[PDB]
């Protein structure tokens, strides 16, 4: 049986450079040779207990794709008698009686976590718990990543944006600290920088990694700009807005980029990135949301089969 | 290049592309009177300037001061009887109204009737600008990203 | 491959004389000769921004009558993570990543036509976009008028209520003024009259329209009486509740029409038609909705069916 | 008039404080070139009116076409070598495509990426433009508004 | 006793043209000699059901400069009553149990009316019911016109906006037309247009109108400008939008005006009026809503005072 | 006519020494020698377009010690103005016809200031424009520091909390810093820090501060301790839980303090000081609040009283 099946993926965390790298290779083969009737028979749910439409529509078409029926919700409130008393716990063990599998996104960490424990032996994947992990995410950065450069080992990767929280910046930090020789370039507001423990497990590996004022600055030396959402609720207005002459994206800036450089972001994009920039060969980000189609087809394909013929 | 004028201001030693922002923003087009503009004319002196001359239209004090923050270079020439009676620069004023935007998207100012009024501070390495109503300080280089 | 294969169906207006009947003609096959795995393997997405259960069930009935998956939401209000300024271009940027046909359903005019520009070549529906089109109603319109008067051309055709601010009224008026012969009778408020610009296509044509106070002033002549849903909340409520004896629908009214008239209406329905009106013959506005299945199944499948045998 | 230029383009007898709206609008003035021009003159029967002299640029046949809802006696003289080799008049062309703000408030064209685009139509009396997106129809007096 | 003592003050067509010379007679004395200490001691309801804010505060600063003590709520954000079968007949029987005069804002027409008869003798003066009335904001305008024309009689009157649906216009038209020799000039969009009724009436009293396209045709004659708000939901944003360029005023059209011209408006004013206009001398409808003080103090003085000397 | 004799309190910094000392020994004389009908006949204008009920009830409690009348209200549970185009300037040239001071609290940064330019001669005083001043609460705190040490000069004076967004400690901290030797300790986690502008007018000064990480540090030589709120939201939780163990106060802390230490707090206070404090004669929050009537009445009196005598 490959080594995921049967398996809960909750956490960037638990699946071994190993295991990302299966990831990696079926969702390279379902994308060229799809098998839409891999599911066939099976029924999935599709939890969203806090509601996001674009993870809910790449993972409800990922199930269709290969041909598996979904049940499911979607919420942000009272999603129906599933409200009152009702624990996370109860829900599980009555859902984990009618499904085959799990999806589910919640407000508060651990919830996919608190989740495994009620499930029986039906897998649960999580597609986000509050500020914890969202690992659906950080596969599918990694094909991109991987599938634009070639490789995963010896990249020199920018990380731009709210690195403090940012939820997609410390998994992918955490899973390209899995592979050799790569160079972070860490370049955030003094307001939103990267978390002491993310730097201090870089150092135990011997990972070179450097915190930068702006963009221009490593602009030359870096083959992925992954950049991220600066959130203006977080910040005062005035704050916000000022930062000098900003960490936004444009087409000029790309001009002494690398050939192979590609800037990534996992969306909404608003401020960040303008309009100039989705003409440059240099963007990513809609092809990267593409991608999350076959990182989450393969997901489910070998949770969910034993030995997967592809 | 462009010929002479026998009265008026002649705004000589504007550097390129400014002298399209000095028409909008200080609304010089708006008189039916004669403006010769040249833009990016050469004068091997600067590589490229720009040059707006305006007849019989005599721009004074302030008007001279506020360019100040937008082609801080340009000799601004009174002519009024064939040739060039005064010779000015744009210095630095006070205080910068109706031409700027306030960086803070919850200062009041952009809902409202309101005319931008900033003040000048100049801090060693820029200019800072603080705002009549929110009275947030900023570096001019964000007042003027824009 | 057919005529409007991978093409986008935004308006009424953009489809020609010849488009209509080839959608009216696949419509009527498919009704007689169900193919429910024609589009096996498609995936679409159901995208109402705006939300419409009829129009939305109409729809996802209309695709899994033929076998595909949907993958969608509804909303009128904060769909999901859809709304922080995540731009419509930008949701359909990424949407075209995952999808095979997008029917979208969005509340200001131009949004299906803004879509078509950032789609690739993945089509979009327009199931409404704000007041300006609704092309796929005005198919199952004309396909009802076709199926119970055995053509398009040479009928006398009633429209009846808010023929102001019906989006419906105005596509069905361009519409029938494609084909030959026909006579239109306008009855509605002076409030709510036919706008100048349909009244002048019209004459363009050489077309016969005539504006009457009543309903029972045409009675006699009329094939198809096209009654819209005059909206309170438009007019003052003695404004609304005045008009002298009204212009609302009951049998009795019915009994100096002609054998092969049908009282159509697009629905919701209140108070326009009473439910006398519902067991005489003439009643034809639910068979009206039956026959939305038909003309969307026929849309989807040409759309998305190269070369379609029926 | 101001005096010649070697190659290009003169664009001569546009109205009076329709200049500079072309200026800004069509964006003549984001170019290396020197441009130099002349508000409020004359040298064109009429009275007063405006000149923009482009070097070294010459218009397409469409943006000769697009200055017609401003400008529309001005003509688009091609220069060569110091004389006109050649002069068009804007006329109407089919589509305004970027210029214009359509008035339909719920119109998708505002909130998005999308430059407007308008289909014109009938010619002299009241020229009907006609939204891209929200497919509405407006007379071209309340489109030019705000 | 004064004539409008003890007397509910429900609508204009209830007042004669001696009852509105009576209470515009006081307020230009209030104005000229206030009188702090005249209602001390009276408790007046301000019962705002229907939540109107610039009419509330002028209503209760005007009984705070008599000395009255105000109590009373706005309920559109909700209180307690109007719901749970509370019916208004049997809120009016509590709250008359303890105030000595009520000022009420109810969305139903009719609502002051059955007020009157379950107040007992408690006066109730109207702050507005639905869309039926509002004399108090008829008589300070009326109050704004004489303070400035000098007189009620033989005046040139435009109505310019929506005249159809504005309250404010047709009680206005109703109250001068007591007066003799008044000439009106409408200007509004066809949809919106001054509702025959009015006319009907003004026909039956020998009083001249006529209807205009654009204030340019008028402004010379006119002593009065009376612009009301094109509530631009009246009209769809494309119908808004283009009149033929619009009816809004701006300081320019004002230059042929007479010197005694004065501009009137009800408020809010979005657009219909350009700040320019306010700069002139003729802008006079914030004069206009400081004389609502007045003519609202005259009110509750005649109606609480059986004798007054002033 | 006393110097601040009409005019508008928007800001501190617009406030000299003497200013400041005077608003400070009014409100020590009208503790001592209550003046009831000193604003009778006076109506204030309560405008808190914000809610914010501890400001609005000592503001109007205010008013009502001298004898004014109070008419206003609080939005956010919103009215009906703030919304339909109705801009806050015409809202204000409204509202100054009819009251002779605004009390105002907006969420808008500026808003004061812009009143000021529309009442004319209706004088403006703040109570809070969004994340920029608020005068009222620098007063009763100055107030309460002055009556408690007797002295505004000289005092060593620890900020502790939420540094950063700490509207009242950055006011504060200049208003102090008008008056000599004033010695600062900031205590706050390093994301709330007091921003560098307040920093470098106290250096301009020669004003000594320095930065300390425990309370423990500095208690021994404190005679003011001003603590704020830290805004769980302004951390993740678990970057608020888990500082080294906190900056919350408790009663064993003000073991070493000098008999003369006050704690002061804003108020809410929901954790950073413990109830135990509170039994402490060093606990001084509570008697803080009630000086804010002090205070308040002292500037009501000041701008609207022409001359003084007390
Ligand atoms: N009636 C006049 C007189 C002079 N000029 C122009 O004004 C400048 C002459 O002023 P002056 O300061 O003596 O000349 P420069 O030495 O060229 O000025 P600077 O060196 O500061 O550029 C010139 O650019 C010439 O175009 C003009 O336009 N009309
Ligand atoms: N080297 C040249 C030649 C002419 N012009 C300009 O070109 C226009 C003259 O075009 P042309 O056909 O030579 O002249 P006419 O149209 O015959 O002049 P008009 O109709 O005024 O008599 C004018 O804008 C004049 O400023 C120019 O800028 N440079
Ligand atoms: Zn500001
Ligand atoms: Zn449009």
């Known amino acids: 049986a490959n080594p995921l099946y049967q398996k809960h993926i909750i956490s960037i965390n638990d699946l071994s450079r190993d295991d990302l790298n299966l990831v990696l290779a079926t969702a390279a083969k379902l994308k060229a040779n799809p098998q839409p009737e891999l599911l066939k028979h099976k029924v999935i749910a599709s939890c969203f207990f806090e509601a996001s439409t674009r993870t809910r529509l790449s993972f409800q078409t990922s199930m269709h794709r290969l041909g598996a029926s979904v049940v499911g919700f979607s919420d942000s409130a009272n999603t129906s008698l599933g409200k009152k008393g009702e624990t996370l716990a109860d829900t599980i063990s009555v859902i984990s009686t009618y499904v085959d599998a799990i999806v589910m996104r919640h407000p508060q960490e651990g919830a996919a976590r608190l989740a495994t424990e009620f499930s029986g032996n039906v897998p649960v994947l999580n597609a986000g718990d509050g500020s914890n992990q969202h690992p659906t995410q950080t596969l599918l950065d990694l094909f991109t990543i991987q599938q634009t450069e070639g490789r995963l080992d010896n990249l020199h990767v920018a990380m731009v944006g709210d690195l403090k929280y940012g939820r997609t910046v410390h998994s992918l930090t955490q899973a390209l600290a899995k592979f050799d020789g790569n160079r972070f370039y860490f370049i955030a507001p003094d307001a939103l920088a990267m978390p002491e423990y993310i730097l201090d497990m870089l150092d135990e590996k011997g990972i070179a990694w450097s915190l930068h004022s702006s963009i221009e600055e490593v602009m030359a030396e870096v083959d992925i700009l992954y950049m991220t959402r600066v959130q203006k609720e977080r910040l005062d207005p005035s704050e916000y807005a000022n930062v000098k002459a900003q960490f936004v994206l444009r087409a000029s800036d790309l001009h002494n980029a690398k050939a192979n450089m590609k800037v990534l972001h996992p969306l909404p994009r608003v401020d960040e990135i303008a309009t100039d920039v989705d003409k440059t060969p240099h963007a990513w980000y809609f092809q990267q949301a593409g991608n999350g189609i076959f990182a989450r087809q393969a997901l489910l394909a070998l949770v969910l089969n034993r030995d997967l013929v592809l | ?146």
């Open chain 2, 1 to 146: 290049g462009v010929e002479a004028i026998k009265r008026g201001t002649v705004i000589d030693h504007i550097p390129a592309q400014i002298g399209f922002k000095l028409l909008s923003l200080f609304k010089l087009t708006e008189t039916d009177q004669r403006i010769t503009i040249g833009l990016n004319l050469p004068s091997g002196e600067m590589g490229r300037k720009d040059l707006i001359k305006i007849e019989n239209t005599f721009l004074s004090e302030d008007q001279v001061d506020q360019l100040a923050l937008y082609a801080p270079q340009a000799t601004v020439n009174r002519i009024d009887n064939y040739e060039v009676v005064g010779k000015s620069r744009p210095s630095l004023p006070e205080r910068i109204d109706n031409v700027l935007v306030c960086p803070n998207s919850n200062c009041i100012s952009h809902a409202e009737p309101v005319s931008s009024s900033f003040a000048v501070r100049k801090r060693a390495n820029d200019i800072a600008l603080k705002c009549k109503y929110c009275e947030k300080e900023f570096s001019h280089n964000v007042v003027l990203a824009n």
